[PDB]
Amino acid sequence: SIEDLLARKPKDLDDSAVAAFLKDKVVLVSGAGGTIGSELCKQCIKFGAKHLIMVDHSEYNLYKINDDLNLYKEKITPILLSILDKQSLDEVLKTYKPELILHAAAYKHVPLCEQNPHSAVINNILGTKILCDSAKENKVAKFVMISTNAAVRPTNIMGCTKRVCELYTLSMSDENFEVACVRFGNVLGSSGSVIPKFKAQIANNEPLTLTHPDIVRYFMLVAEAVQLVLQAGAIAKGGELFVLDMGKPVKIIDLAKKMLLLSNRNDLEIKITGLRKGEKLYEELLIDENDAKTQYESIFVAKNEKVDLDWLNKEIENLQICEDISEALLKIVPEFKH
Amino acid sequence: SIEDLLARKPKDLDDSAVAAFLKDKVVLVSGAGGTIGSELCKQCIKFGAKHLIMVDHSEYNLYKINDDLNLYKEKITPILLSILDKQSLDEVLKTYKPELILHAAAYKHVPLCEQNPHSAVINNILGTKILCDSAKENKVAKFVMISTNAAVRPTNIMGCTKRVCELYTLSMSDENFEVACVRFGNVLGSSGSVIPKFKAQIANNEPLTLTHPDIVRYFMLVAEAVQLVLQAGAIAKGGELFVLDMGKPVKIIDLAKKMLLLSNRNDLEIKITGLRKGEKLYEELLIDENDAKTQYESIFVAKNEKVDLDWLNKEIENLQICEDISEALLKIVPEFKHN
């Protein structure tokens, strides 16, 4: 398998630490039925959580993860809900009183967020604000925000919104409501990503569409990223912006060729179709030489400064009505180059 | 495959009527990346729409239908959006000025809507209200509501919510804003449905889980339901509640058995697991012997009277506040018998 070949296989997976962190917890996962959310769900059950509240706005995604976990049906509750519905979300948190929220709900596609920036802002930033505020109000002990390497020096709407969500959640962190964010890169075979695209092109005898001959990405398996996110949540004391190490980058052309080789399909061409708007060619330096080490060699802590929430709330209000979203996002993230 | 077997293959598919109806139109499809919406999008391009506005809240579903239609990308615009965001929907409608809205966005699962009746109400009823209101205000000429046979004498929250959407949209119909609803039954192989569930159980060496040995459903292919919906929309003058003829119902036990026979896994057990809450054994009579015929033999018009919108709007507000959704729904839909 191509997944197998590019797997990170990190040597510092710690089952026992995740078990101790999750034992008998009521846990709520937003985006429960997504690529990452579904794997969080599965690992929460595997590592002994008492009760899993699965929140997703996509009815098929929710149905599917509920169905996948049907052997544990007594321990899970499928909540069909947008996190933008504050009043319903508050009712959910007061009812179940989760001690941990794993926030994986977001819009993540670079091109679609470029084309729909307002919805990106609303779903990502406002949805994060609503979920985060509700968690703090409802005395959730720990809140882990799934973030992305795309939030570093963002060149696109999606990335920028995720950076704003880091700023917001980390600024809400305190002794009673401990927030951690976890940045990582491309999850192998995730929803709507390049591996399923190539797989489908091959199966339909189409040429593979490669954006640029020199483009590279960092990859890991969903089970690896999720477990490390959970180990990061487990060691968090509140306020940490974590980042995962992912090994060496992989050329997408090499990925394309390996896929072709694995299906004995060297009858097919690889066609250059050009960079998509917002897209980086090399991403960013993963780990700064001065990020703090943790006890896990795959997990580092990056520097982050709280921001004045009053100011941030004003900017977020403006984001929901303003005419130029890109320019507005810049006033919040001055490193944003769109 | 199982789909082949149970196809309807109506004799009265009419490409040309659909082509004439869709020619050069700007068409907005809500729920565009769903099972039915995706097929609506494809048929809109096939039959010569000018421009397709694809609205969906699931980024993956939208991504996928957008990619599926890559060959025709200059004719399609992917709008990542919940129809509950009135202000943004309004802006989309003003920017693109669609002439036709095909409304396929909803929550459709009996059990999930049983378990989340408030979100069923919000996403189905309020989402329909917002989209329908915005369409009329923005002078969209024709609005087609995808409905369901479950709206008839509903026994579950989902079906009841769909019936309220019928009442709302049809009561908004007038000479400028023509509304049709179309009711039909199970679409073979649709998202989250019994066929994909049985396929996975088989692929995983699991017993098939059959709710009840006697349960039956009416089935048709997505391409058939969709084209018939488009033909209904083509002949509509406003205010019609259409219903499709779907042929003979199918015992789910016979569908299970046939799946096991086709993959040669008669080694697997069929386990009876019990009816799910809200579920009917035999659905309902499809075509009332008095429903009116149309020019197509697969499409009929079911009786329906407008309700006062003043009344309905206030009942819809009550739905968003009440203690007890089921009781509140019964006020609007007095034939609702909630299992």
Ligand SMILES: NC(=O)c1ccc[n+]([C@@H]2O[C@H](COP(=O)([O-])OP(=O)(O)OC[C@H]3O[C@@H](n4cnc5c(N)ncnc54)[C@H](O)[C@@H]3O)[C@@H](O)[C@H]2O)c1
């Ligand atoms: N997939 C990757 O390669 C990758 C890499 C780094 C970070 N991330 C981050 O992980 C998070 C999840 O990514 P994914 O691959 O699982 O995407 P995904 O789209 O498969 O899953 C996201 C889930 O959230 C749900 N959702 C979205 N908005 C919602 C809302 N308002 N209310 C409730 N549910 C909502 C979706 O329906 C979906 O099931 C996103 O920020 C993403 O940016 C992903």
Ligand SMILES: NC(=O)c1ccc[n+]([C@@H]2O[C@H](COP(=O)([O-])OP(=O)(O)OC[C@H]3O[C@@H](n4cnc5c(N)ncnc54)[C@H](O)[C@@H]3O)[C@@H](O)[C@H]2O)c1
């Ligand atoms: N599948 C069947 O058997 C069947 C039979 C009869 C009627 N119907 C009706 O057909 C319609 C679609 O069913 P389907 O099988 O395609 O289901 P689906 O879930 O596959 O498709 C619905 C689509 O609507 C989207 N959506 C839901 N709420 C939304 C919102 N608030 N804003 C924007 N997008 C939203 C979803 O993301 C999804 O892509 C529903 O109206 C259902 O009520 C289905």
Ligand SMILES: CC(=O)N[C@H]1[C@@H](OP(=O)(O)OP(=O)(O)OC[C@H]2O[C@@H](n3ccc(=O)[nH]c3=O)[C@H](O)[C@@H]2O)O[C@H](CO)[C@@H](O)[C@@H]1O
């Ligand atoms: C999963 C998804 O949809 N996007 C995520 C993905 O972004 P990213 O945009 O990298 O995800 P993709 O899987 O879409 O693309 C992976 C790589 O393949 C290339 N490519 C893509 C499609 C194609 O047809 N041909 C082609 O060559 C891209 O240019 C990119 O170099 O990882 C980032 C982490 O680093 C996250 O921030 C994004 O949320």
Ligand SMILES: CC(=O)N[C@H]1[C@@H](OP(=O)(O)OP(=O)(O)OC[C@H]2O[C@@H](n3ccc(=O)[nH]c3=O)[C@H](O)[C@@H]2O)O[C@H](CO)[C@@H](O)[C@@H]1O
């Ligand atoms: C998920 C879905 O598309 N639901 C639609 C489906 O409902 P419906 O609930 O009939 O659709 P499903 O495919 O879930 O179920 C079909 C039949 O198979 C049975 N079954 C299902 C699952 C299983 O594990 N075992 C089993 O035996 C059910 O009891 C039912 O008799 O068609 C109706 C139209 O008639 C629509 O109103 C619903 O929106």
Ligand code: NA
């Ligand atoms: Na899966």
Ligand code: NA
């Ligand atoms: Na359960």
Ligand code: NA
């Ligand atoms: Na499809």
Ligand code: NA
């Ligand atoms: Na396009």
